[PDB]
From Swiss-Prot, chains A, C:
InterPro entries: Aquaporin-like, Aquaporin_transptr, Aquaporin_Z, MIP, MIP_CS. The keyword Nucleus does not apply. It is found in: Cell inner membrane. This is Aquaporin Z 2. Belongs to the MIP/aquaporin (TC 1.A.8) family.
Length: 228, 233, 228, 233
């Protein structure tokens, strides 16, 4: 069990340090930077890679809304939920801090939103709170449908990391302009704690919406996918 | 053919999958393709469409067959992989999934007011081809691209290839198809995908829609006929 | 055997119509075009996808220099070499022609080099004939090392298309500026026949260099990789 | 540990693989990254480096273990996956492969005369960090990135994951590492890769080279130590 919490901790750290750190260091670099596509690929590849490295140890959730959805689907014991959520939020916070220390090694850098998720005025594209809510619920619900589908016994072992990592990239290709893309309450919490201000005031949305999307995808999955 | 899952489950699978294909491929185009400085361009859209299929073919492919595409259902029927008796119900689940995804995209887009959605990721030709290509060019490239899409689907799901790899060959073939043809038609190869967007644009998009039923369905049947000639036995 | 020639024909057609057609229609499209990266990804994905669809029928060479390298490696009967080369060059020519018909459906388009490979003045980056020669030999030799390695019995079945497709993308990411990237005599012949002029005068280089690279990679492979 | 292939074959495998990693990752950077209008950028370089490893790990991974990287050989020794007695010979084959690839890139580049190769894809820090990041930033990010590279290599090659998927997790993890850190150090995580380029630039690149031996090797050992704590049993 301690092995499983460490798997979640290192995994969520990798997710945030790789995804957010590609956003902070590289996305807007002049002439050669990696754009929304490269951040999207980054975040999907943190999940693909640690899903292969530690998924067979903890299940490789790396994401509170995943742990909730897999509990609602009856794949995962509700008794492990809270500990997993604590291990995950701790990895995110420790990654946010390592990124912070490294980022400021560049003289007079402006961290800005520091890859925090936001809506309205803090939506990259100026989309409303209601747009933010709907798209985070829809995308997280589908994220769980892919995770529950691709880890079902009808799918041969070993392919789920590819499915689930690249589904995370696809989710970023769709929604970065709307919310910078959360679908993961832990991945939103670390960056926001370093920004404070508006980032903390909007943080609730990125706990509430992914958790409702993850639970909804679980319920939908149960209705047509999980039975033999 | 035998039944492996009851029809309601296969139809929901097809409904949710085609919803994902349009919501993710058309959503990436509407929200992110042209975003100033950092937007994802034709490349990021092609990746997104391929990934909706790769990820839903893994998620529900084992339930319905994972068509998400009337042209694919038709091609597999012509190749003798799928029963004609399931054709019409699948096509209806797929077109319903695409219309509901278009509507969902629209609702989310209204949260950024005063914005012009332009063609709303609709397919088109002539003045409505991103590069000004003619109706004949559109017709040809949709026939050839959908035919090869069918040949990749049929060969990668054949028993001579190990289970589990199809979603990756099929989803990446769709990304490849958009890399080639977005400048020509915005890329259909999928009558349901063309239909939901066009119903919201109306006008020229409804008027040109016929072509993105006819060409993909012709190409899908042609791919299937070609495959049965050399690949299936 | 007729099944195998048709596999090669459809395969090389897909390679050229997908790769070259991504170059002609999309690579330089204003604001949104796919650049050298998207052409590189295109060409690798034609091979990955048709290697899965028909590789188990003909071996999925799609490329005269592959057929030569696999013959030199003793993987493939020298008696099938010529027929495979004819089927491959025929797919390329028929794809070049379909691309031609479709491309000119755009009023007053300038086809330009029409994705032909070239060197010196016709190298995108102005690299010399000698640069062109060396990089086509090196990259084709490695292409065969990957193909022979990834289809060896020590590698589990089904992964070779991923290896070999993405190796082709990697080769394009390295060399498009130097020669537009051939590593495939058939893929160079179709486009050049439609351009004539300098494209025909340089065509020999793109037969000679990939065939020497493919044969060399086969010989190197035999020395350290092919034995149990 | 038992012998599966004789040492000459393992060394040639490592030599050719590290040659490919530098020739393809550094070649893509030198020839294509900054090409006017169509160049491939930090994204295309990160993809290229990841793909040299994915494709050579499939091609010769089954012969030598597919390290291509002194930091990887060290990490696997510390994790008890590889014998210390093979360490020095591997590291020498890898550094030789990288120097010969640098030389090969150089020869090909001379065919476009009067050109400035700049840093020639060398790694660096401070003034020689593409984004001006300090020595401490460089050191930290190379330790953390190489440690995770080791954790992904160790977990994906563990017996609890099916054979054949490692080249894909390991090569894509390298692409991810470049997506994160090219702005900081140009991305090393690999002392042999840093060494060949720097020997051609001389000057500051030879002077800063120490850091791209020390940090990757420290991070590789740390990743291995962490892995043995929770992952291996």
């Amino acid at each position: 069990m301690g092995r499983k919490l460490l798997a979640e901790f290192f995994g969520t750290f990798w997710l945030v340090f790789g995804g957010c750190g590609s956003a902070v260091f590289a996305a807007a670099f002049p002439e050669l930077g990696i754009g929304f596509t490269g951040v999207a690929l980054a975040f999907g590849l943190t999940v693909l890679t640690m899903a292969y490295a530690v998924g067979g140890i903890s299940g490789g959730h790396f994401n509170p809304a995943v742990s909730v959805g897999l509990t609602v689907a009856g794949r995962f014991p509700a008794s492990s939920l809270v500990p997993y959520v604590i291990a995950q939020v701790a990895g995110a916070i420790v990654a946010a801090a390592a990124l912070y220390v490294i980022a400021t090694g560049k003289a007079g850098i402006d961290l800005g939103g520091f890859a925090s998720n936001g809506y309205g005025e803090h939506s990259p594209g100026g989309y409303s709170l209601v747009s933010a809510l709907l798209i985070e619920i829809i995308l997280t619900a589908f994220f769980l449908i892919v995770i529950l589908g691709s880890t079902h016994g009808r799918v041969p072992a070993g392919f789920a990391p590819i499915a689930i990592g690249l589904a995370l990239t696809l989710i970023h290709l769709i929604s970065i302009p709307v919310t910078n893309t959360s679908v993961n309450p832990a991945r939103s919490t670390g960056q926001a704690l370093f920004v404070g201000g508006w980032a903390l005031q909007q943080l609730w949305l990125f706990w509430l919406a992914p958790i409702v999307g993850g639970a909804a995808g679980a319920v939908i999955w149960k209705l047509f996918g999980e039975k033999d």
